[PDB]
């Protein structure tokens, strides 16, 4: 039934943004309401998305899914019957080149800055002692353009890190950290590392048990004429799949 509600959307730094919407408002409607509330230009809306996440005790975010066009975010979150789930606004492109468009606007730039800062703070981005010194300086100095330009050069800038999970490559039940970005999946074995190029994935599938446990399996071209299925077991399997699809999509738009 259509009725007006207040919705909390969090930014990357935990600042809360409250918007008035209808229960029957869809994802795009809510997104537009948030953007309106923040004074974000219309022409940047396509650069950001809303995500459903679970907040853990330590305040870190486990990404659950990107909200799709047909969804009703209020329903989406309330129907889960858990206060741990939050809607988050975050940049939704992969090529850091698009940062150029976003940084032309002050509010866009603030959003990108906030999420980059949080990415470093949560250890998603890997830096050296000197870089850490500089970064920590700009933070105080708040130039932000320069801060972002520096951040763009950092390892795994623009990547999404997932909660520790397991995979069956190279061995069964191996503990792994998965990260998605720059058209690949990075697997850190927490140390040896693997890179699974999206263009080398013939397909992927999200599976669930029955007599919970979610898996993402992709059929990977390991070498010439040799395909091998790789399976990652993770509660964020769907988010990983969404990311694979999203990266492929971005590649299609770019290719065209």
């Amino acid at each position: 039934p259509t009725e007006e509600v207040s919705l909390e959307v969090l930014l990357s730094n935990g600042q809360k943004v409250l918007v008035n919407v209808l229960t029957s408002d869809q994802t795009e409607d809510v997104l537009e309401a948030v953007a309106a509330k923040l004074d974000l230009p219309d022409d940047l809306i396509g650069y950001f998305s809303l995500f459903l996440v679970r907040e853990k005790e330590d305040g870190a975010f486990s990404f659950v899914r990107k909200l799709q066009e047909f969804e009703l975010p209020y329903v989406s979150v309330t129907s889960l019957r858990s206060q741990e789930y939050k809607i988050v606004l975050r940049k939704s492109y992969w090529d850091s080149a698009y940062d150029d468009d976003v940084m032309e606007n002050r509010v866009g730039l603030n959003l990108l800055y906030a999420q980059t800062v949080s990415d470093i703070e949560r250890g998603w981005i890997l830096v050296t002692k000197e870089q850490h010194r500089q970064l920590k300086s700009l933070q105080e100095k708040v130039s932000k353009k320069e801060f972002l330009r520096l951040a763009q050069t950092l390892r795994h800038y623009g990547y999404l890190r997932f909660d520790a999970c397991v995979a069956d490559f190279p061995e069964k039940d191996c503990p792994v950290v998965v990260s998605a970005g720059n058209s690949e999946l990075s697997l850190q074995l927490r140390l040896r590392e693997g890179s699974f190029r999206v263009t080398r994935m013939r397909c992927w599938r999200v599976t669930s048990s029955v007599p919970v446990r979610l898996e993402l399996a992709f059929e990977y071209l390991m070498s010439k004429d040799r395909l091998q299925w790789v399976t990652i077991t993770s509660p964020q399997a769907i988010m990983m799949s969404i990311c694979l699809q999203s990266m492929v999509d971005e590649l299609m738009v770019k290719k065209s």
Partner: peptide, 10 residues
Amino acid sequence: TCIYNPLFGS
């Protein structure tokens, strides 16, 4: 079942 990746092989 498994959705084919349109970019696969290139």
